[PDB]
Amino acid sequence: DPPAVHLSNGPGQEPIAVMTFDLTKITKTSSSFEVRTWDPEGVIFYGDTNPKDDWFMLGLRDGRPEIQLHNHWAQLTVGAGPRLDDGRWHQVEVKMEGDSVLLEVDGEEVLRLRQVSGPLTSKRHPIMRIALGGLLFPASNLRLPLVPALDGCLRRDSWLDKQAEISASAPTSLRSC
Amino acid sequence: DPPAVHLSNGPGQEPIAVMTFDLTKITKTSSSFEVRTWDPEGVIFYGDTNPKDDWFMLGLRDGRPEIQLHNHWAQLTVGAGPRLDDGRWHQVEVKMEGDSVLLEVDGEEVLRLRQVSGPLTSKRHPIMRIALGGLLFPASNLRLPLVPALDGCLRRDSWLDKQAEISASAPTSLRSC
Ligand SMILES: C[C@]12CCC(=O)C[C@@H]1CC[C@@H]1[C@@H]2CC[C@]2(C)[C@@H](O)CC[C@@H]12
Ligand SMILES: C[C@]12CCC(=O)C[C@@H]1CC[C@@H]1[C@@H]2CC[C@]2(C)[C@@H](O)CC[C@@H]12
Ligand SMILES: [Ca+2]
Ligand SMILES: [Ca+2]
């Protein structure tokens, strides 16, 4: 089996990994991974350039994907797709394509948020953070609060553009599944 | 004894802790801690609002404090103070006072970088990061490269302003001394 990691560490709700990227170097604006869980609710990943007004979250709520986003063009809270809380590995892809954010699950397009973003490259503060398994702000600050901990597993993950990655958090924390 | 933590985890040079702060809420612009080491060289802490052009590092080089800083007003590489690599606990305080950054060691003022910063509050991108025990950029990007790992210990630490802290990294990583 390909190497999987725990999405939560237990008591605390701090992300298990944080990656930071130089925005002027991003050419690939998609992430993809595999996820397995029995948990109906929690954070799979969070991205931001600013935690007060340029941020994105993908989690589960009622076993289904949920996207929360606030940036200059769009502010939204959307559920879409099938229940992923069945203990089977699922393929997920999040892509930004033109002004749209796409969500793919198991090879199918399940959500397309159109006209939600201008070009990254020409963005207002050129550093983007990616956190896995939680937020980089307290849960009460979401548009719609959820309890962040997602007792699940992750593998085959690839975030945005490797060539633009400025830092990656200590991998001393990671816990194998 | 008050509880101490390892500044490095060993193989990797990733910071052992990352704290992020809302700049419009900072009222206390100082940090202070205690440090004990036999290591002549490495990073004690790094701060930034942007890792490409608004960043600060405090480490040791030849057993002495070294500050590296690049922001809009100042770009500099300065050694000052006594050797701290003697295996005794040392008190250190880093303070910003008006346009000056002060460095105190064991209750004495050893360095004052004057006219190196305008007001934080009215700053160009309101999120500051603090990393302990390494940088949030590769070492080759410093003004003057050093091997970041500092095999040392830290206690009684307090960073900037607690009331402005947006996130603190998972404390699952921390290793007691
Ligand atoms: C979903 C995207 C784009 C595609 C993907 O790989 C994940 C990443 C997560 C951060 C998002 C980004 C789209 C643009 C956003 C929503 C910015 O406005 C703020 C955070 C960004
Ligand atoms: C030293 C200070 C200010 C005082 C202290 O508590 C640590 C903190 C580390 C980040 C520094 C900051 C002074 C202002 C700087 C140098 C900004 O320009 C960029 C990073 C900042
Ligand atoms: Ca949960
Ligand atoms: Ca060293």
What resolution in angstrom units was achieved for this structure?
2.3
Contact partners, residue A153, CB within 8 Å, separation at least 6: A4, A5, A6, A7, A35, A36, A37, A177
CA A99 to chain centre: 18
Q: What is the CATH number of the domain that holds A50?
A: 2.60.120.200
CA separation (Å) from A41 to A64, A66, A106, A168, A174? Answer: 8, 10, 19, 26, 21
Nearest Cα residue to B36 out of B153, B121, B157:
B153
Type of residue found at B177: C
Partners of A168 in the β-ladder: A19
8 Å CB contact between B84 and B66: no
| Alpha helices (runs of H) in A66-157, residue ranges in sequence order | none
Domain count, chain A: 1
Under 8 Å CB pairs connecting chains A and B tally to: 68
CA separation (Å) from B42 to B13, B34, B132? Answer: 10, 15, 11
Which residues from chain B sit within 8 angstroms of residue A174, using beta carbons?
none
CA separation (Å) from B119 to B27, B73, B75, B98? Answer: 11, 11, 17, 7
Give φ, ψ of A8 to 5 degrees: -135, 155
Ligand 1 atom with least separation from CA of A50: 19
CA A134 to chain centre: 9
To test the contact with chain B by mutation, choose from A136, A165, A167 the residue with the greatest count of B C-beta atoms within 10 A, namely A167
Distance CA A121, CA B73 (A): 26
Out of A51, A135, A169, closest to residue B127 by CB: A51
Q: Domain of B6?
A: 1-177
Neighbouring C-beta atoms of residue A167, cutoff 10 Å: 21
**B176 burial class (0-12, 13-18, 19+ CB within 10 angstroms)?**
exposed
Distance CA A47, CA A34 (A): 18
Cα A110 to ligand 1 centroid, rounded to whole Å: 17
